Design an enzyme around this catalytic site. Structure first.
Site, PDB file in Angstrom:
ATOM      1  N   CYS A  47      45.823  22.433  46.175  1.00 59.43           N
ATOM      2  CA  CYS A  47      46.370  21.572  47.192  1.00 59.43           C
ATOM      3  C   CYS A  47      47.044  22.429  48.251  1.00 59.43           C
ATOM      4  CB  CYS A  47      47.326  20.586  46.498  1.00 59.43           C
ATOM      5  SG  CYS A  47      48.358  19.699  47.644  1.00 59.43           S
TER       6      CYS A  47
ATOM      7  N   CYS B 228      50.493  21.261  49.530  1.00 56.56           N
ATOM      8  CA  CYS B 228      51.457  21.586  48.474  1.00 56.56           C
ATOM      9  C   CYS B 228      52.030  22.961  48.678  1.00 56.56           C
ATOM     10  CB  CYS B 228      50.808  21.441  47.096  1.00 56.56           C
ATOM     11  SG  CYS B 228      50.170  19.809  46.692  1.00 56.56           S
TER      12      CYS B 228
END
Length: 105
Positions: free
Chosen positions: A32, A35
């Site tokens: 991700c 993230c």
């Protein structure tokens, strides 16, 4: 300042040990991108808000926790007090993260 969670036992223990305090959980994954973009900011918040508890859960390490918390989006931020979920949103929105902390603390 961020509590790295590596089991359901540890997640539950953390929600207990928090007492009255707001708990902010960052659900992430290693694939991700957003993230990664917000990780340093999340850690900054944990140093700023020393009276709020911050947990990090990698959804592939703690699949049972991810499943039971019904995580969909990467990242997801969930907010707890006394073991109850009191907020949630997804995406790597720094301003919204901090504002939610201030709303709930």
């Amino acid at each position: 300042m961020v509590k790295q969670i590596e089991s359901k036992t540890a997640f539950q223990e953390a929600l207990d040990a928090a007492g009255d305090k707001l708990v902010v959980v960052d659900f992430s994954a290693t694939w991700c991108g957003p993230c990664k973009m917000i990780k340093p900011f999340f850690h900054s918040l944990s140093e700023k808000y020393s009276n709020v508890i911050f947990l990090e859960v990698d959804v592939d390490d703690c699949q049972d926790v991810a499943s039971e918390c019904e995580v969909k989006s990467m990242p997801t931020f969930q907010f707890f007090k006394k073991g109850q979920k009191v907020g949630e949103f997804s995406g790597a929105n720094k301003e919204k993260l901090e504002a939610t902390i201030n709303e709930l603390v």
